[PDB]
Each structure stands twice: as C-alpha cells, then as structure tokens.
Symmetry: D3
C-alpha cells in the first residue's frame, strides 16, 4: 500500500563503452552530469555483448529511476551527447528508499 511515488519512470540509456565526449568516456560524463543535476540516483551496467542496427565495444547501460519531470530534464541534456545508442523509458513503481 505504501509507495514513494506512482509517477516514477525508469530511464535506460544504452551506449558503447568506447563512445566518447570531448575525449572522455561518454558514460562517465553522463553519470557525472546526473550527479551535479541532483537526480535521485543511477545504476550503470556493462553488457558482455550488444548490437544495434542503429564487438570490441561492450554495451554500457545507465539506468535512472525518478519522477517524470526530472527524467525529462535528463533526456533533454543527454540527447545531444548521444549519436549512437538508445534511450528507453517506461513507468515503474518505487516502494522503498532510505
């Protein structure tokens, strides 16, 4: 019955591990921005293989669960930095925290 929010969204950012932004690993910059943006949190996963119609470059997935508006901000910031990968989003229910 108790839930933090019912309009929470799960954002997933798929990029290659070697993708770069101004010489730095794109995922680190992305995670860096999320931090100074005051976003709830994030989890980064590294796949063992991946491919996108549109492998020395393992997949890295940056996942962020937050309120809708916050996630909209993030997409608007990160869209420019990503020329190859994908961004998905779907609702989810957050039950606990700390």
């Amino acid at each position: 019955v108790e839930v933090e929010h019912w309009n929470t969204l799960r954002l997933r950012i798929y990029i290659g591990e070697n993708d770069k932004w101004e010489g730095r690993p794109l995922y680190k910059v992305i995670v860096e921005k999320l931090r100074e943006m005051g976003i709830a949190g994030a989890t980064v996963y590294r796949g063992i293989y991946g491919f996108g119609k549109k492998s020395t470059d393992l997949p890295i997935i940056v996942e962020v669960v937050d309120r809708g508006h916050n996630i909209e901000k993030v997409v608007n910031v990160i869209k420019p930095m990503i020329k190859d990968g994908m961004i998905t989003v779907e609702p989810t229910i957050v039950l606990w925290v700390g």
Copy 2:
C-alpha cells in the same frame, strides 16, 4: 497464442554489494529467503557503478504479484537503505515441453 502468465510482476531490489545482515551479504540472505518462501525464481546482477567502492547489487524476481508482495514485506525492514521497484510484465514462456 500461448503465454505462461499475464498477471506477473517484476520485482527489483537495489542494494549494496557490501550491505550486510546479521553478518552476511544482504543479497545472499535475500536470495536464501526467496528460495525458502518458494518464489518462482530470481536473477542477481552486479552493476559496475551506482549512486543512490560499493558495487550495486540488483536481485530481480518475476512472479505472481501476490508472492512479490509476500516478498516485499519480509525484506522492507532488511533494506535499511537502497530501493525496491515493481512493474508489470508478461511471462511468455518457460520451456518445459516442446511442440
């Protein structure tokens, strides 16, 4: 067409690789529980980085929303700090009989 269940939910427990319980790893204890409560199954992942050093540990469980809640109750207290999430999903297959 055929599916296994259209009433299932995906439970995701986000904790810390270093989180402990009564002396043991919080994820190993949870999985033990889940296995003794008769849950459908579970899959544990370890991220490379996370913020909410410590590696994020995510135990995932897909089952009747009615087992998931049974699971939520028994774990809500053990998770002093972290996050629990849940959302619908359809289980299309398991692969017990081929035809």
Copy 3:
C-alpha cells in the same frame, strides 16, 4: 515530444551461461539469429547468480534483451522458443525516445 518508434516492447530471455544448441553457446546462437533476421538490436547481460523452478548453481544467468516493434518481437519469440529449455521469456512495453 518525439519518440523513435510505434509500439515497442522489451523482450528478456533468461537462460544459462552453460546452455547449448547444437554444440554452441545458446546465447551467441540466439544473438546470431536475431542479427540475421534484421532485429533492431540486442544487449546481453551476465548475472552473478540465479535460480528457477537440474542446473549447476555455478551456471551463471545470461539475459538477452531485445527492444523492437511488436511484430518483430512476435517473430523473435516464435523462432527461439524451441531453444529455451527451463529458462524464461518476458515482455512488456516501453517507449524508445
């Protein structure tokens, strides 16, 4: 205000790292077929532990994730059901931006 595709779904296939199909690592076989079929993409994860409903506990979980249009996913599931023994396949909507 602009999303890439119409009706996309996220397929997740769970199997064992040690699973095989005709002497080959089942997941690589699955990924291969997906590519051949012309699927939008796929990501493969390796878990550190997992259990279901006779498999070694040291047999790590492998999750093959595919995000694509509905008919495509339908087609994928149609092709890989025969190769999934005692695993699991899930699907649910998502929006790809």
Copy 4:
C-alpha cells in the same frame, strides 16, 4: 504516496446489448456472478455504436469493466469465457489510489 491495492488490473468485456445466456441479458448475468463471487466492483457502459470481426448494427455495445487484484481477474475471466461469443475481453494494469 498511498495506493489502495497491490497489482490491480482493469478487465473490459465487450458484448452485445442483445446477447443472452439462458434467456437472460448476458451482461446482467455477468454482473450477477461477479457480485456473487465477491468481486471488488464493476461498471457497465453502453456504447452508441460498435462492430467486431452476424449481429445487427442496431445492437448496441455493452462494456463491463472490472478493476481488481490479478488472481481475482484471472478467476473472473475463467468463469465468463464460456458466455462470451464473438465479443472481446481485454486487460491491462492500473493503479487504484
């Protein structure tokens, strides 16, 4: 931050206003059984027009909507499938606050 129930779903049953089951208006029969079973609730709508895949065009649509926990909906669908001829039953999640 407080929702009433865990895993609720919205069942929608589509049938014809003129449909019958043992000489009675099928929808009233469905609603009756739902009540007997102890279902959380139900709402019935009457459309002004509808068509599917031999029924009069003047035979208005009747939609029986049920919002309840998963197992309950499972049970409902199990009971009314036999009474639904050339209609439609849909389901999808929802959160009841």
Copy 5:
C-alpha cells in the same frame, strides 16, 4: 513518431450520480474544480449500472488525461470529497491536440 507527451496519465474517478458535496452533485463540483484549476480537459461518462464492494445510483466516471504533476494536484484536491467510489490511474500516450 510525433507525440505531445510520454509522461501523460489517465485519471479515472468513479462515483455515484447521487453522491453529493454541500448539497450539489459531487461530479459537477469535481468538474467545476478541474475547470478553475486549469487542467487540460475532462470527459464525464454515465454508466447504466455499477457496484463497488467498497441500483438507483448510476455510476459517473470523470476522466482526465494530463501531465503527471497536474494529475497529482487533482487527486490531492479531490480525495477529501470522495468517501465512496474509486480513483485509478495508469500511463497513456497523447498523440494529438488542437
């Protein structure tokens, strides 16, 4: 591809037609508030029958499709006014407008 929003929510308010608030029909007051609240819009339906474990009182359903935050406001305003009925919410995608 073109969509107004991806974090739109469909809110549904189920009450009886005779339900009242300070002597006026509860649904009219509800619709009245939504209007002076600047909400996107709303559609009211009247069922031909209904029942809630928790019929001379036909069901009235007030439906509102809007951004998440707006819908949160609405729930917070209307929750007090409703002692018998139900409030559901799930995501939806808005494609067009005017």
Copy 6:
C-alpha cells in the same frame, strides 16, 4: 494459459458529437474508414459532458499497433481539434470456439 494477442494497443479518439467532415458527423466518417481499412473493430461512446451543447464522442479501437498507426495517419488531419490517445492492452479472448 491462452490469450489472443499480447501486442495489441487501445486507440482512443476523442471528438465532438457535432464535429463534421465534408458535411457528415466526424465519428460516423471515421468508423466508416476504420471499417473499410479492415480494422479489428471499434466501440463508440458518448459522454454526458466534456471540455477540452457539444457531447464528447470517443471512438475506441483495439488492434495491432501496426493497424492503429495506419489509422492514426489517416485521421490526424480530419481531427482539427480534439485528442488521440494510445496505450498497451492484452486481448484475452474473442469467443469463436468454446472448449
């Protein structure tokens, strides 16, 4: 268990009872279209009140998300002002064969 489709979407077209097209009621014209494009089916509702006198008219269509989009294109222009919505749904049955 068995279902009809887990890939379907529910399309909802909100217009005005008085909205017209080339001289006819916008909803009657849409339904005509939907029937000639071979869509699974449709259900039309008339609210008692709405604001976005005029009665709100809602044509609902459940079908492959691939027919729904075919439908969206052909109607987006006809709907000068109103609203179109879409979201997933599972079609559990149709009732053609009992067993």
